[PDB]
Amino acid sequence: SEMFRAYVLERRGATDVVTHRDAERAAAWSQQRQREYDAYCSLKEAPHPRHVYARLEGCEGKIVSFEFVFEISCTTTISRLKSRILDALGMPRDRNIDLGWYLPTLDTCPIHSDEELMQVLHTDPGIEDPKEK
Amino acid sequence: EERRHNIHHTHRPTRPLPDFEEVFERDVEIDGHRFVLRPRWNPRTLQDV
Amino acid sequence: PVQKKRQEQMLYGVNIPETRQMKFEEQHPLLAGALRKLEGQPKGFPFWYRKYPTRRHAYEYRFSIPVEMLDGYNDDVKKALSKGMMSIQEKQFAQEAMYMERYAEHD
Amino acid sequence: LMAHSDTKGIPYFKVDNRGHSNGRVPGVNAPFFGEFDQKMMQAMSRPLN
Amino acid sequence: IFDGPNVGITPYGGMTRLLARPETSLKYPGLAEFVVLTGASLFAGDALR
Amino acid sequence: VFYSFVLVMKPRQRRFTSQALREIGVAVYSNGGLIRSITNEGIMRPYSRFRDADNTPLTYARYIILQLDMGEEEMGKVDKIIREHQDVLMALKLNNLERPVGIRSGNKELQAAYFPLDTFTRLEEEINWSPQTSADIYTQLEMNWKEFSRTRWSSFLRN
Amino acid sequence: NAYAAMELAAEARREIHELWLSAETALEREKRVQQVAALIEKYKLDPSTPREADVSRGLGDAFDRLLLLCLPLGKTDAKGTDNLERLMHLAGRNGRELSVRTIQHLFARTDSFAEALAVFYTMRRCHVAMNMEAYYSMLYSLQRLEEEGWGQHFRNEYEENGAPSEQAMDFIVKGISNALLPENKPWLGRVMFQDRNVPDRRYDTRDFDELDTAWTQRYKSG
Amino acid sequence: DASNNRFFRGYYYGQRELHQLLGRPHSLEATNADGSNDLSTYEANTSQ
Amino acid sequence: EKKRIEARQMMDGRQALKKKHLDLLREFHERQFFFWYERASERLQNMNL
Amino acid sequence: SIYAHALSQFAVCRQPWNEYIGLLTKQDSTPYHTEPQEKPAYRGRKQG
Amino acid sequence: NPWLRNRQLPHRRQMEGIARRVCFVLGIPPSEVRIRNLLLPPTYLDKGSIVRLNDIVFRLSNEQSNLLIPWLTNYNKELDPKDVDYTALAKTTNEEEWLTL
Amino acid sequence: ANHPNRQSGIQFLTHYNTHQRFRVNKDYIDYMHWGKEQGQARLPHRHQRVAFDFNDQLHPTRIGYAWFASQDPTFGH
Numbered sequence A: 001s002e003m004f005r006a007y008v009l010e011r012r013g014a015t016d017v018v019t020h021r022d023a024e025r026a027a028a029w030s031q032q033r034q035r036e037y038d039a040y041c042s043l044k045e046a047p048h049p050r051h052v053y054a055r056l057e058g059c060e061g062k063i064v065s066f067e068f069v070f071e072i073s074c075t076t077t078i079s080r081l082k083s084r085i086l087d088a089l090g091m092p093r094d095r096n097i098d099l100g101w102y103l104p105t106l107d108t109c110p111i112h113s114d115e116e117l118m119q120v121l122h123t124d125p126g127i128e129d130p131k132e133k
Numbered sequence B: 001e002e003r004r005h006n007i008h009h010t011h012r013p014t015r016p017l018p019d020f021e022e023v024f025e026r027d028v029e030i031d032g033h034r035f036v037l038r039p040r041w042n043p044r045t046l047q048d049v
Numbered sequence C: 001p002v003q004k005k006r007q008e009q010m011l012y013g014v015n016i017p018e019t020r021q022m023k024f025e026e027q028h029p030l031l032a033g034a035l036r037k038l039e040g041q042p043k044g045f046p047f048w049y050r051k052y053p054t055r056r057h058a059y060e061y062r063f064s065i066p067v068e069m070l071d072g073y074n075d076d077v078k079k080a081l082s083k084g085m086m087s088i089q090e091k092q093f094a095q096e097a098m099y100m101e102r103y104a105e106h107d
Numbered sequence D: 001l002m003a004h005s006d007t008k009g010i011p012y013f014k015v016d017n018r019g020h021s022n023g024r025v026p027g028v029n030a031p032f033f034g035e036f037d038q039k040m041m042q043a044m045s046r047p048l049n
Numbered sequence E: 001i002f003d004g005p006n007v008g009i010t011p012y013g014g015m016t017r018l019l020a021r022p023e024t025s026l027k028y029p030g031l032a033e034f035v036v037l038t039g040a041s042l043f044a045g046d047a048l049r
Numbered sequence F: 001v002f003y004s005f006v007l008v009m010k011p012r013q014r015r016f017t018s019q020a021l022r023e024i025g026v027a028v029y030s031n032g033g034l035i036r037s038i039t040n041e042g043i044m045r046p047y048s049r050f051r052d053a054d055n056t057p058l059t060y061a062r063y064i065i066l067q068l069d070m071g072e073e074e075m076g077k078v079d080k081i082i083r084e085h086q087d088v089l090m091a092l093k094l095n096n097l098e099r100p101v102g103i104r105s106g107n108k109e110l111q112a113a114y115f116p117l118d119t120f121t122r123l124e125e126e127i128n129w130s131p132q133t134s135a136d137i138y139t140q141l142e143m144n145w146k147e148f149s150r151t152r153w154s155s156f157l158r159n
Numbered sequence G: 001n002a003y004a005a006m007e008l009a010a011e012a013r014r015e016i017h018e019l020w021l022s023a024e025t026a027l028e029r030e031k032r033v034q035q036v037a038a039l040i041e042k043y044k045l046d047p048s049t050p051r052e053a054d055v056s057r058g059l060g061d062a063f064d065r066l067l068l069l070c071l072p073l074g075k076t077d078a079k080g081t082d083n084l085e086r087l088m089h090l091a092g093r094n095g096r097e098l099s100v101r102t103i104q105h106l107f108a109r110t111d112s113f114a115e116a117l118a119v120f121y122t123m124r125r126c127h128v129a130m131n132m133e134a135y136y137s138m139l140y141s142l143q144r145l146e147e148e149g150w151g152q153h154f155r156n157e158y159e160e161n162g163a164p165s166e167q168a169m170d171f172i173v174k175g176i177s178n179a180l181l182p183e184n185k186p187w188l189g190r191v192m193f194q195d196r197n198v199p200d201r202r203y204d205t206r207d208f209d210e211l212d213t214a215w216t217q218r219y220k221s222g
Numbered sequence H: 001d002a003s004n005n006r007f008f009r010g011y012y013y014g015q016r017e018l019h020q021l022l023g024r025p026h027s028l029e030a031t032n033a034d035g036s037n038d039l040s041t042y043e044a045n046t047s048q
Numbered sequence I: 001e002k003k004r005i006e007a008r009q010m011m012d013g014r015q016a017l018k019k020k021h022l023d024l025l026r027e028f029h030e031r032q033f034f035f036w037y038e039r040a041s042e043r044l045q046n047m048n049l
Numbered sequence J: 001s002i003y004a005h006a007l008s009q010f011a012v013c014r015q016p017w018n019e020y021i022g023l024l025t026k027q028d029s030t031p032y033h034t035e036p037q038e039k040p041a042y043r044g045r046k047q048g
Numbered sequence K: 001n002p003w004l005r006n007r008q009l010p011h012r013r014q015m016e017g018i019a020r021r022v023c024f025v026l027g028i029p030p031s032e033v034r035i036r037n038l039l040l041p042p043t044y045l046d047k048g049s050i051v052r053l054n055d056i057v058f059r060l061s062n063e064q065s066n067l068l069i070p071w072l073t074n075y076n077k078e079l080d081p082k083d084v085d086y087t088a089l090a091k092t093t094n095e096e097e098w099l100t101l
Numbered sequence L: 001a002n003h004p005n006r007q008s009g010i011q012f013l014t015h016y017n018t019h020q021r022f023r024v025n026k027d028y029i030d031y032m033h034w035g036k037e038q039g040q041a042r043l044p045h046r047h048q049r050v051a052f053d054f055n056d057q058l059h060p061t062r063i064g065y066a067w068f069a070s071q072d073p074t075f076g077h
Helices: A023-044 A076-089 A113-124 C002-012 C018-027 C031-037 C075-080 C090-103 E015-020 E024-028 E031-037 E044-047 F014-030 F077-084 F117-122 F136-156 G002-022 G029-043 G062-069 G082-094 G100-108 G113-125 G132-159 G168-175 G205-221 H011-022 H039-043 I002-047 J016-020 K012-026 K047-057 K062-068 K081-084
Strands: A006-010 A015-020 A048-055 A063-070 A101-104 A108-110 B022-032 B031-038 F001-011 F034-044 F060-069 F088-095
Touching: A015 A023, A015 F136, A023 A113, A023 F060, A048 A076, A048 A113, A048 G002, A048 G205, A063 A076, A063 A113, A063 K047, A076 A113, B022 F088, C002 C090, C018 C031, C031 G132, C075 F034, C075 I002, E015 E024, E015 E031, E024 E031, F001 F014, F001 F077, F014 F034, F014 F060, F014 F077, F077 F088, F117 I002, F136 G113, G002 G029, G002 G062, G029 G082, G062 G082, G062 G100, G082 G113, G100 G113, G100 G132, G113 G132, G132 G168, G132 I002, G132 K012, G168 K012, H039 I002
Parallel strands: none
Antiparallel strands: A006 A015, A048 A063, A101 A108, B022 B031, F001 F060, F001 F088, F034 F060
């Protein structure tokens, strides 16, 4: 309730004006929160060094593993990862490859874009047998 | 579950219940092909027939 | 004179019978044990929920607020949710809930 | 305004029991397989057996 | 689905005939062995052609 | 609020205003009730001249807002106490503050069916908006929302 | 830059796994607690640490097993409850939501009642929005505490006797007298039509590991 | 009685009273020839 | 006699079921109580101020 | 199905008839779509 | 009651429970415990049921049983057609629990 | 029926407790503002109808697409 009783009367230039007494304070607040949002997002784009498992869909079981660093600030990153995967599978780098996310819920997604891939890295912490280091 | 917890479905039953381990053979390798799970045929191979 | 006594006894206030506290302690001795450890301290987990099975069951304070939920708050708030602050309609509903509870076969 | 809370809503809290009153329903709860009958033609028919 | 060498039995239902018509040998030589040996699904387009 | 009043009062010397408000307040305490806020406002010019106990019409009057928690029985007593005081020109009473007009109409409330405790906690100022309120409070509101929701449990589970 | 933070975070999770895979009697309650505090203060896992150079970002899934590595709270001080609320606070910043699996084993880790309340309160301070999973996992934990108490009592009186009483027997059969969320009517404890009882018993480290390793094998094969 | 004689199975005066008395559930158009949807509690719990 | 034993079989079934329905209703009320407490706590926090 | 994947690779999806019939070239097509106005209804024996 | 059978034999959660409760009280190792069900026909007792009562529940080799219970050889009673299905029970979904027992 | 308050007629095809629509004490109708979409103001609203036409749609089944995954991928709502 003590917000609504916080208005006030100032004279700006030649004319009378009703303002919030606390308005500037709330502006500082909201601005700071925005800057923290910016920190958070810029930090989700920061280099993410994760261990990559990739399972080729088909009757031939083959699983490729390699350590990959994801830099999601400047599409090209997805194609880098796909180029690498194909390099390990023993196939030409011109294969049209659909990447997909294997969820801990045993579901599956397509990944069409880098901005999405970042979100996949951030959202899945990974599921790992710690015995295997 | 029934195979573990129910004596009346296991021992000398009215009607038979299948055994997973008996139907399937785990981890098979046949001429370059790796099968996670493959069923048990008495002539196991196409050569054996 | 009897009915008059019933309304005079509704007006000034009702009360939950210690009968309910008793059967609460005998039925769910663990929960009552917990509440018995925690008296006077503010609780973030409502252990007392078995004592009040229904919304209607708690009449001692307004808006069906159980007693032991008021532990960590202001005494002003405690007075503002008290019986003295009920409307008359609320008081009727109180008397009704108390009696309904004493004659009910289950909750 | 008056009711706006930091605790998320009923759906997040999953307060409710039951669910759809008919239990498992191919359209609503479970998945739907096969074909849509938009006219009621299969839905009222007489068992020939 | 004309299968069942996968369940350890020979196919039934007479579709064998359809697969052996001299027409099928003309249009899709080898298809008969493909579907009878490999349990494999044929669809509307394949049944039309 | 549970109850509120708007009291249009005669603009007297301050000692008198203070005596009168002490009388109304004590009349509320004796009757076993609380005062959420006693808000003062200035001496305003109303749209209608009021006559006082002297039957002398008045151009100006001091406005005073009461917000009370009582029983509905003994606010009859406080009502005819306030209205019968000589320094009060007019008093209008709001009893609608617990169930105001904008709620509980065809499941308008999401995730609850008539939660009464939403509008009781609140004061009159946020149930009924004053004219000066602008889009600016939409800002403040949320800094007072988020902030609150951060510190509440930690403050409560202290003691 | 933050690539360094992630590297040092790799060494971090290496030694977290190092002490998690131990899981021995050589690691006692006191020793585990102070070893954990040692890790936190080594790698700056306090909420005071800035957003960048936050070590807790690059702990995949080692975060939860580090988290429930805190849980049984040794007998020295009430200091213990802080280690926990440091870790959780960081999650709050980072954005990683706590899995219900994780907090279920978290309660399953609790030794006494005051500790269970300690946990629930702690994640109250940590701005966790309480769900039905929260409540039911807590209740389950209380129930298994009492069941454990009575189990202790009856094995105890069986020891000084040599043959069980009938009370021991029907306790064995129907469980706790007048339990909340009981076994004989299983349809109560359910949330979202899945039964919720993980917390009704203790788990070793190898149990946890069993489940996720199972998951991994399923990926590598199916 | 009600099985061989059509005048007994008239519902709204004879049989209605009988079912009210015996405590069977009853209605206008019922499953059983006489007035009654089902057995009473006594008839269900006791072999006569 | 046969009709009656199966009649009371069904009756006992139904009465059992409404016992079960009773448990479900109790626990529904409990659930929405917890939720109620989550909101009401939050409001009284504010009223403390 | 624990194992059947052999078939899964040469397996065939079902074809998109809904949008194919949607996007067929039509002879009522208009550069800008206008919803029809309301048709006359039956207001009862006195009104028609 | 063919209605009331579907519940009667314990839920898996109850078997977990009983198992670890025995583990607490008797001091038996939780590694090796085997807890099983045996449910017998409602109104009478056939050969099958008695054989799997003698053989499994109690461990009795054929000769010590034939010693102890001579009459089992002459006892031929088997399930009537009406009573065959007492063993097979209705499988009910978890979203369906409000409807059927 | 020319009597006022009897104008709503005899409809059996309603869901109310009388087949005489004008003795029903539940829903009193509004002759001036009603019946844009239903024709006459007497007749039951689109959502309460217990009788259905040949070429008219019947009631929607309420939900309160995920479950069509087996169907035509393009098939909309």
